[PDB]
Structure formats: C-alpha cells, structure tokens
Design a protein around this ligand. Sequence first.
Ligand SMILES: CO[C@@H]1O[C@H](CO)[C@@H](O[C@@H]2O[C@H](CO)[C@@H](O)[C@H](O)[C@H]2NC(C)=O)[C@H](O[C@@H]2O[C@@H](C)[C@@H](O)[C@@H](O)[C@@H]2O)[C@H]1NC(C)=O
Length: 153
Amino acid sequence: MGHHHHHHHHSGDSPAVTLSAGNYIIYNRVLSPRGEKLALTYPGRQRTPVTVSPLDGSSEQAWILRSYDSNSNTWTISPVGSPNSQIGWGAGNVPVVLPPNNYVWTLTLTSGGYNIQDGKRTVSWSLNNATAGEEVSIGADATFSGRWVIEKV
Ligand SMILES: CO[C@@H]1O[C@H](CO)[C@@H](O[C@@H]2O[C@H](CO)[C@@H](O)[C@H](O)[C@H]2NC(C)=O)[C@H](O[C@@H]2O[C@@H](C)[C@@H](O)[C@@H](O)[C@@H]2O)[C@H]1NC(C)=O
C-alpha cells in the first residue's frame, strides 16, 4: 500500500470524500428518466414510508448524518425540515420516519459510489421502478436499483 506524485495519482482513480457529522443529500446511483438526480424526499408527515423524487435542494429533500458507533459503521439520519424525528424501519420491509429512540443505519463507501444497509447486513435500501413518487423499499441488493450516492451540503 502506497502513493506518489510523479508516476502515480489518486484524483482520477479513487474517491475523494468521507461521511461526517453534518448536512447531506442522498440519491440513487442511476438518476431518473427525467435526466436528473432521484433523491430521498419527506412524505409530508410522520409515521409514513420514505419517498423518492427529483432534487432542487429544498428543506424536504435535504437531510443530516450523525454518528452512533464506529465498531459497526452505524449512524442516524433525519430530514432538515423535521429533525425532531429520524429514519426507522416499519418491520414491513420499508423505511419510515419516526421520533428518536435508538434506530440506526449502516453506510458504506466504494470505488465509485455509496451503499445503505441495516444493522445486520441482511438487506439493503432499494427501489422497484426507479422513478419519482415511488415509496422506498428494503430487500436484497440490486445492480441498478439498490445502490446510492451521497454528497455534503
Ligand atoms: C433499543 O435498541 C433499538 O431497538 C429498536 C426497536 O425498538 C431497533 O429497531 C428495530 O430493529 C428490528 C431488527 O433488529 C427491526 O425488525 C425493526 O423494524 C426495527 N424497528 C424500527 C422502529 O426501526 C433498533 O435496531 C437498529 O435500528 C434498525 C432501524 C435496524 O437498522 C437494526 O438492524 C438496528 O439493529 C435498536 N437500535 C440499536 C442501536 O440497537
């Protein structure tokens, strides 16, 4: 393991970011048929499934990330417009928004993207039509409907 500056590089062969305590946006690695990003969006109330839609940077499309552990790479996630609650799991194979207790999620970086999984790695966050207005889902991973990208705001 190593690097150099006259016969090697990093800025064109490997990622250049990492997660930290702050405000972020989360969108699918496959965009949408609209020719634009497909990002997590607040469903308009509490105790409902998370939804996915186009992105403009609005208070219902932007989120926060906060650490919970380091031995398990687990964090908590909340919308910037309703941080009095956070993303949780309705036990019905879909994510929901609910007041805080101890609900957490696992994040992973790769050579050209991000991933989002449960605390036991048995499942991953995914979609079924990869289009706006769809409710987010949880199940086995998928090459073009179960991978993500994350950016700081
Ligand atoms: C007190 O510890 C926390 O307890 C809650 C339930 O009150 C756990 O959330 C539940 O986890 C079940 C699987 O372990 C799952 O079937 C159920 O849907 C889920 N309920 C809710 C409302 O999310 C917490 O479990 C962690 O967070 C969830 C979201 C998931 O990622 C799970 O894999 C994690 O272990 C649990 N929190 C902690 C920090 O242990």
